[PDB]
Amino acid sequence: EDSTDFNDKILNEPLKHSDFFNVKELFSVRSLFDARVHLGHKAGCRHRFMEPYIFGSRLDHDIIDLEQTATHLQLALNFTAHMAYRKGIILFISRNRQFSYLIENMARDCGEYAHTRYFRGGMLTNARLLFGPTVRLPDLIIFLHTLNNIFEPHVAVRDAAKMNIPTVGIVDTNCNPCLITYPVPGNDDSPLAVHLYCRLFQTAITRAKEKRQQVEALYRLQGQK
Amino acid sequence: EDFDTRILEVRNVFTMTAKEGRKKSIRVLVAVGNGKGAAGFSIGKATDRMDAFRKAKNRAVHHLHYIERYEDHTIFHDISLRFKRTHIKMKKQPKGYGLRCHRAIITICRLIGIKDMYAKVSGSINMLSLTQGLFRGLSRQETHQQLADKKGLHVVEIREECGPLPIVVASPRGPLRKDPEPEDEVPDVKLDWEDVKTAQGMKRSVWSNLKRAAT
Amino acid sequence: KVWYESPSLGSHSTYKPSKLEFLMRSTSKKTRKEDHARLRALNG
Amino acid sequence: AFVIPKKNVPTSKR
Amino acid sequence: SNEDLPISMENPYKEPLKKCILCGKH
Amino acid sequence: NVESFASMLRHSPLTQMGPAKDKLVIGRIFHIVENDLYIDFGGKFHCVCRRPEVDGEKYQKGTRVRLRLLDLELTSRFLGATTDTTVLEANAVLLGIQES
Amino acid sequence: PMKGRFPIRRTLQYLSQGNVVFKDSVKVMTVNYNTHGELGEGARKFVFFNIPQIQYK
Amino acid sequence: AGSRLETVGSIFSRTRDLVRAGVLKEKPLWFDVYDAFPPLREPVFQRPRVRYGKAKAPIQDIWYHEDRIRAKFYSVYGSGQRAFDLFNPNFKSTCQRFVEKYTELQKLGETDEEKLFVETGKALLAEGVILRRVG
Numbered sequence: 043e044d045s046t047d048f049n050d051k052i053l054n055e056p057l058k059h060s061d062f063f064n065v066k067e068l069f070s071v072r073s074l075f076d077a078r079v080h081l082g083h084k085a086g087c088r089h090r091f092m093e094p095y096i097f098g099s100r101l102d103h104d105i106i107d108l109e110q111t112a113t114h115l116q117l118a119l120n121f122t123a124h125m126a127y128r129k130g131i132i133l134f135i136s137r138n139r140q141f142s143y144l145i146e147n148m149a150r151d152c153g154e155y156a157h158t159r160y161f162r163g164g165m166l167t168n169a170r171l172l173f174g175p176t177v178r179l180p181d182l183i184i185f186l187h188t189l190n191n192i193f194e195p196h197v198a199v200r201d202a203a204k205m206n207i208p209t210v211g212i213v214d215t216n217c218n219p220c221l222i223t224y225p226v227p228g229n230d231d232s233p234l235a236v237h238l239y240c241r242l243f244q245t246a247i248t249r250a251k252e253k254r255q256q257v258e259a260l261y262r263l264q265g266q267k
Numbered sequence: 268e269d270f271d272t273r274i275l276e277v278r279n280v281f282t283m284t285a286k287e288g289r290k291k292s293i294r295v296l297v298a299v300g301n302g303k304g305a306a307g308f309s310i311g312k313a314t315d316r317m318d319a320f321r322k323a324k325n326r327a328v329h330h331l332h333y334i335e336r337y338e339d340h341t342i343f344h345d346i347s348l349r350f351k352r353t354h355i356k357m358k359k360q361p362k363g364y365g366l367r368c369h370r371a372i373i374t375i376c377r378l379i380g381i382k383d384m385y386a387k388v389s390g391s392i393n394m395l396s397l398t399q400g401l402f403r404g405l406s407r408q409e410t411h412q413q414l415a416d417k418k419g420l421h422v423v424e425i426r427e428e429c430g431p432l433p434i435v436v437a438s439p440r441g442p443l444r445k446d447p448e449p450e451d452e453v454p455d456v457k458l459d460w461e462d463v464k465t466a467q468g469m470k471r472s473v474w475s476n477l478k479r480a481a482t
Numbered sequence: 483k484v485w486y487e488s489p490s491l492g493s494h495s496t497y498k499p500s501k502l503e504f505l506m507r508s509t510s511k512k513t514r515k516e517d518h519a520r521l522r523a524l525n526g
Numbered sequence: 527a528f529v530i531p532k533k534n535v536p537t538s539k540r
Numbered sequence: 541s542n543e544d545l546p547i548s549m550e551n552p553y554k555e556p557l558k559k560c561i562l563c564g565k566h
Numbered sequence: 567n568v569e570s571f572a573s574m575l576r577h578s579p580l581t582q583m584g585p586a587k588d589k590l591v592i593g594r595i596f597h598i599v600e601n602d603l604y605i606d607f608g609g610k611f612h613c614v615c616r617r618p619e620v621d622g623e624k625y626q627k628g629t630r631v632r633l634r635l636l637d638l639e640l641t642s643r644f645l646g647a648t649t650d651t652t653v654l655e656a657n658a659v660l661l662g663i664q665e666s
Numbered sequence: 667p668m669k670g671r672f673p674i675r676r677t678l679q680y681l682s683q684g685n686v687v688f689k690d691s692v693k694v695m696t697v698n699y700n701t702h703g704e705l706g707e708g709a710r711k712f713v714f715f716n717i718p719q720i721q722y723k
Numbered sequence: 724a725g726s727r728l729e730t731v732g733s734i735f736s737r738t739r740d741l742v743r744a745g746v747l748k749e750k751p752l753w754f755d756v757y758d759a760f761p762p763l764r765e766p767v768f769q770r771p772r773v774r775y776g777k778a779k780a781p782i783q784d785i786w787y788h789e790d791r792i793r794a795k796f797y798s799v800y801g802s803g804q805r806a807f808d809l810f811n812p813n814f815k816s817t818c819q820r821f822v823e824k825y826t827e828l829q830k831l832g833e834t835d836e837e838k839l840f841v842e843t844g845k846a847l848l849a850e851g852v853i854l855r856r857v858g
């Protein structure tokens with residue numbers, strides 16, 4: 043009797059709004075341009091599945107179309123906020139060691155999880171053995187870098203799809219976005235780009251968790267009286 | 268509990284080993300299904316035949332395909348595909364036709380829930396290529412709703428038992444096109460000589476259309 | 483490629499022949515097929 | 527449906 | 541449409557091809 | 567009257583620079599490893615320059631320096647490869663320190 | 667599969683779909699057509715698709 | 724009960740289909756969010772293929788009209804001894820200052836190229852700019 047009203051006022055209400063968390067105010071095409079997000083790899087490194095998201099090549103250097111990045115980033119942040127609102131486990135994954143420390147701190151500060159180390163075989167596909175039969179796996183995996191250190195796709199991309207876990211991923215011009223649920227074409231190498239991404243996801247996640255508490259508290263106060 | 272398991276192949280594989288000479292292992296192929304469109308298969312390997320059964324059947328339930336069925340009894344359209352050297356040609360059939368297919372296809376079809384279908388296997392008759400080739404073809408069949416949505420037109424089914432009555436089977440959810448589909452006087456579709464030879468009464472086989480037990 | 487093999491998956495890996503790398507190496511690890519090549523060619 | 531012999535005893539564990 | 545869009549043309553910064561010491565000499 | 571991306575790109579200093587070979591740029595040292603200076607100069611990838619022998623102690627984190635660029639990204643395609651191998655760093659020659 | 671383009675042309679069903687049954691007067695039909703030219707395309711399709719049906723009937 | 728066939732459809736299609744078949748008792752936490760706000764492309768595995776023959780990538784080189792002026796300026800006067808500051812988003816190089824003057828004089832009706840280039844150098848010299856010809 044009271045559960046249907048709970049799930050309808052709290053879990054189903056955010057899903058009826060196009061931007062329930064107002065994540066569009068977090069970034070702009072100018073803010074992305076100043077962070078050098080449009081800078082891609084050389085044309086010789088281009089992945090053919092990244093051609094849709096490329097604006098062009100400036101002297102053999104690919105430029106990422108930030109008009110698309112903004113639309114993809116809106117979807118990626120919106121999804122991430124909704125999963126944080128629903129109390130989902132968000133796992134950040136990246137093998138770029140220049141940013142391992144930064145990413146681990148961003149995860150701890152937002153109350154989420156980070157895996158920036160050597161990804162061991164079967165962490166996702168064999169989790170019950172490695173952690174225990176009652177281990178809960180992540181509900182959302184966010185890739186700040188989708189490639190490993192040998193320039194191949196991070197094993198967790200395939201393993202996330204195997205386990206039916208949606209993935210958010212920054213995909214540079216040399217990356218493969220086919221299996222990434224919410225790809226975001228953008229520069230993953232420049233420190234300014236990576237720092238920006240961490241602020242956006244950290245802020246989106248932190249806002250969504252605070253929104254969940256506000257709604258719950260109001261729903262309880264109104265329930266008693 | 269809703270899933271049934273069927274064996275498709277049990278093979279004895281012999282591995283030559285550095286110190287122990289020829290050793291005997293078991294490779295098992297099993298298929299699982301619930302009879303309502305969800306079915307899968309997995310290979311099992313072990314020294315004991317019963318450990319291979321456990322591995323295959325337990326692994327297969329984690330690699331389930333969903334198979335779309337027309338009216339929950341047959342496939343949506345004729346399927347002709349090749350997997351490696353194994354060719355499989357499947358034909359959509361009406362109710363009461365039964366499963367007139369390779370015995371392994373019959374077994375898998377009961378697990379999927381297909382009641383009426385014809386299939387002909389040509390080339391290499393490799394159980395594994397046949398099994399994974401069959402699931403590849405059944406998982407890539409376009410439904411009537413997908414065709415209607417893709418072309419934004421009505422799909423109308425004409426049944427000779429129902430005469431000229433037009434039966435709309437699927438309508439596009441989005442807008443409905445106003446321009447008729449172009450009527451190419453002659454379609455440039457490739458035909459199977461086996462299908463044509465039969466329709467012209469030139470197919471003579473003592474083994475075709477033989478009386479068999481209900482399948 | 484040529485009959486000389488160049489299929490290595492980690493062909494883009496950065497070759498790092500230094501004294502520190504040898505100490506930070508798995509003892510189980512054994513030299514790969516094309517691992518000697520870099521040594522044969524670096525010596526040259 | 528049919529029965530396969532059970533692989534091992536659950537007590538045989540740490 | 542838009543004035544700031546890129547325009548199609550040949551590389552203006554392209555450098556000449558290399559030439560041997562005897563290129564252009566009998 | 568919101569500026570478009572095509573507008574930002576046309577008027578960007580990196581776009582206006584043209585080719586990067588033999589272009590003088592100002593970099594900033596952000597990371598140092600022994601005598602290896604990691605310098606960002608506004609591009610996608612940083613460059614790594616060895617500490618100059620003269621006035622080596624003047625090069626510290628935050629020090630702004632003058633560079634002569636050679637390539638924004640060091641990449642090459644090797645025989646039997648479908649893509650380009652990249653070392654993920656720019657090629658630049660360290661000239662000295664920038665002072666006012 | 668059946669060899670050639672438009673293998674439907676080599677089926678008894680297709681050949682029986684011709685609607686031109688000449689009167690007994692007709693003894694010889696000569697077809698002069700051009701292999702190239704946009705204005706002779708219908709004549710090429712007539713030779714390609716319909717001559718088989720006419721001869722069958 | 725599930726499906727690890729990551730190359731068969733997408734996580735949504737496999738989850739939606741197994742939910743319909745009753746194989747999955749409960750929908751995953753993300754399913755309702757994906758349904759409401761789906762991605763632009765459904766994430767389906769694809770195999771990258773290599774182009775052969777007359778197939779070429781559609782990416783186009785980014786060029787501007789002023790790039791012709793920049794190539795000539797670098798040829799005639801070389802790269803300025805002034806250093807580029809790519810951190811300041813409003814930085815103007817000597818070449819950009821030349822290009823802006825070259826564009827202004829073109830809008831005044833001058834159409835010759837060789838004449839429009841020499842008058843621009845004089846204007847900058849009058850303004851105090853150092854233009855040392857390379858040769």
Ligand code: FES
Nearest residue numbers: 558559560563564
């Ligand atoms: S380069 Fe040798 S003749 Fe021109």
Ligand SMILES: [Mg+2]
Nearest residue numbers: 214229230231
């Ligand atoms: Mg990158």
